[PDB]
């Protein structure tokens, strides 16, 4: 031999990102954490009143 090979290689990016907006789905599921608590919080105390 008396052989040195030092090499590099390249990447294939994974799928599932047609557009970044997809993470806005998380902004949705934030909102259905946002839009859920006050329903019961006023529901049970609406039963109280």
């Amino acid at each position: 031999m008396a052989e040195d090979a030092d090499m590099r290689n390249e990447l294939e990016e994974m799928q599932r990102r047609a557009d970044q907006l997809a993470d806005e789905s998380l902004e949705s599921t934030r909102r259905m954490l946002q839009l859920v608590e006050e329903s019961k919080d006023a529901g049970i105390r609406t039963l109280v009143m």
């Binding site: 031999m1 052989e3 040195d4 090979a5 030092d6 090499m7």
Partner: protein
């Protein structure tokens, strides 16, 4: 003798079977034999069963 005194198993290798043109690949195929022993030794101290190695030809 592995059967005589129980090791986990023999992993047998041949010398010429691990040699890589690339610089760093010819030492790691050796160390992957001993890692399996190193784990058990550190974990279970000094009453562990043998991790046994065999080289078909080292020469």
């Amino acid at each position: 003798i592995g059967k005589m005194l129980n090791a986990r198993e023999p992993k047998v290798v041949n010398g010429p079977e691990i040699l890589n043109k690339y610089v760093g690949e010819s030492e790691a195929n050796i160390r992957k034999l001993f890692a399996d022993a190193e784990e058990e030794q550190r974990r279970l101290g000094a009453n562990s069963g043998l991790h046994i190695i065999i080289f078909d030809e080292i020469d």
